[PDB]
Amino acid sequence: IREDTPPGSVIQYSDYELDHSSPFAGGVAWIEGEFLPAEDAKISIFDTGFGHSDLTYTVAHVWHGNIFRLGDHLDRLLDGARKLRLDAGYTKDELADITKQCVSMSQLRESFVNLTVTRGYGLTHQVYIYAIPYLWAFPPAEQIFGTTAIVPRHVRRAGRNTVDPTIKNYQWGDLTAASFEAKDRGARTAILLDSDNCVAEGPGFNVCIVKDGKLASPSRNALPGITRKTVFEIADQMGIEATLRDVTSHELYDADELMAVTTAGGVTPINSLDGEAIGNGAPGPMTVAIRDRFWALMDEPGPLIEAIEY
């Protein structure tokens, strides 16, 4: 339900308890039209979403009982499903209700919410939704005090003309390989390049590059992330020039600050690349400012958040 976060930091779980009388408490899956406890969530082994990874998905997070940019996530999910010739069979508004209901029944005030649309089995396409406890791409301690990264010697991000990274997918072959190479080298994570040695993204996150007070993030071989979108709105409001563009490998190694951004955990400072400190090897000023603002958004009433009705 929760884990430790650095005391006094901008990241704090809610203070509450699960009603264990309900089998739904702690995790809810909506599979084949029926809500289920997450423990029982199962799909046909013959779904081509398994055998061909023929699917797309999105993840929205719930923080302090508020779901963040669910409308943006449903647009991205439906747009990508259309690009894959997938028909969800539900309108966006319908999926929002089902998703909001999934969280409500879970009782999770902090939640990792996944909506998956697969090609299905014999051919009718399948929608799977689940809301489970919050998952961290990087532990909360690293959201606060920064993480470490390497660039893989042996791996590149798949290009948009192969397994298209601009559609959010489960095909992590390169991301998994890069992660193992990171652990092998004693790093927490990897930043992948594309085939032209431009920055692509990391396993499960976009990368933002700070140089001379400007913010850049890869435009081509990267998911158009909702967190990155949010980060760019924050930067804009701070009067920071933020640009989606090609970021070369030169720029990556030369950065003043680096950060990872993804729904599951927000904005993570990246303290070192290939063992070399970025800046002073601690979270950079813009990263701290953007991250603190990002977590404030989870509590400020406005169009980005919607209260779950528990």
Side-chain angles (χ1 to χ4, degrees):
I1 174 186
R2 71 176 57 74
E3 30 179 286
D4 293 10
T5 63
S9 79
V10 296
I11 298 171
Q12 304 294 344
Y13 280 90
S14 281
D15 175 52
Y16 74 110
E17 86 281 40
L18 279 187
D19 195 317
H20 272 121
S21 79
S22 153
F24 291 135
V28 169
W30 176 66
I31 303 193
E32 260 159 65
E34 68 165 16
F35 299 92
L36 303 183
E39 215 56 36
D40 298 336
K42 299 251 165 127
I43 65 160
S44 174
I45 192 165
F46 302 111
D47 192 324
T48 51
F50 189 54
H52 286 358
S53 202
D54 200 345
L55 65 84
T56 190
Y57 79 114
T58 203
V59 176
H61 92 135
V62 190
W63 200 254
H64 292 167
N66 306 316
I67 190 142
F68 185 68
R69 311 194 71 136
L70 180 66
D72 291 330
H73 278 280
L74 300 169
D75 288 336
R76 183 178 74 196
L77 173 72
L78 290 178
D79 186 51
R82 188 267 305 166
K83 296 238 209 94
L84 301 185
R85 315 200 193 175
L86 293 178
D87 170 22
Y90 300 82
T91 54
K92 154 179 180 192
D93 258 330
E94 269 177 311
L95 287 169
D97 286 336
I98 303 162
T99 295
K100 262 118 64 163
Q101 171 170 355
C102 266
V103 178
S104 196
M105 315 171 15
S106 71
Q107 288 196 285
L108 292 162
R109 306 248 307 160
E110 284 77 56
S111 184
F112 174 103
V113 171
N114 177 316
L115 288 90
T116 296
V117 185
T118 85
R119 176 100 49 211
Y121 42 92
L123 205 55
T124 90
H125 308 153
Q126 284 313 283
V127 185
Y128 308 122
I129 306 189
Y130 60 79
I132 51 162
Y134 203 87
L135 294 167
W136 298 90
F138 307 88
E142 305 207 325
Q143 310 289 342
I144 301 312
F145 303 115
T147 194
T148 57
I150 52 90
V151 181
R153 292 192 198 102
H154 312 296
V155 181
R156 292 278 165 106
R157 185 84 170 100
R160 60 153 301 277
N161 67 335
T162 65
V163 187
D164 192 346
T166 66
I167 293 157
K168 199 176 186 149
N169 66 82
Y170 285 170
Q171 309 185 37
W172 274 43
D174 44 333
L175 305 181
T176 301
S179 280
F180 279 134
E181 195 190 322
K183 323 285 207 32
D184 289 349
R185 299 159 67 172
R188 276 324 223 64
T189 202
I191 297 161
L192 288 78
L193 306 185
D194 69 15
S195 60
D196 296 330
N197 283 62
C198 288
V199 179
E201 61 187 347
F205 55 88
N206 301 115
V207 181
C208 295
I209 294 98
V210 181
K211 184 77 203 271
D212 300 331
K214 301 173 237 237
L215 181 66
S217 193
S219 50
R220 186 187 283 194
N221 290 301
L223 189 72
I226 295 311
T227 311
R228 189 193 69 188
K229 175 186 204 194
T230 311
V231 156
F232 270 42
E233 284 160 1
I234 299 168
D236 198 27
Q237 181 72 197
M238 304 176 160
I240 293 153
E241 182 172 325
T243 309
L244 296 171
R245 64 166 173 86
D246 282 337
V247 179
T248 65
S249 61
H250 294 284
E251 287 166 324
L252 173 60
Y253 280 92
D254 192 45
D256 291 338
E257 329 182 9
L258 298 171
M259 55 189 91
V261 303
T262 189
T263 295
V267 179
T268 311
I270 295 160
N271 293 343
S272 61
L273 188 54
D274 290 352
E276 302 277 72
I278 306 283
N280 71 333
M286 207 195 260
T287 305
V288 168
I290 295 194
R291 171 202 68 198
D292 291 358
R293 179 59 182 144
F294 166 84
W295 283 102
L297 297 177
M298 304 318 138
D299 287 317
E300 262 175 34
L304 301 194
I305 48 165
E306 201 217 275
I308 305 294
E309 256 140 31
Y310 296 91

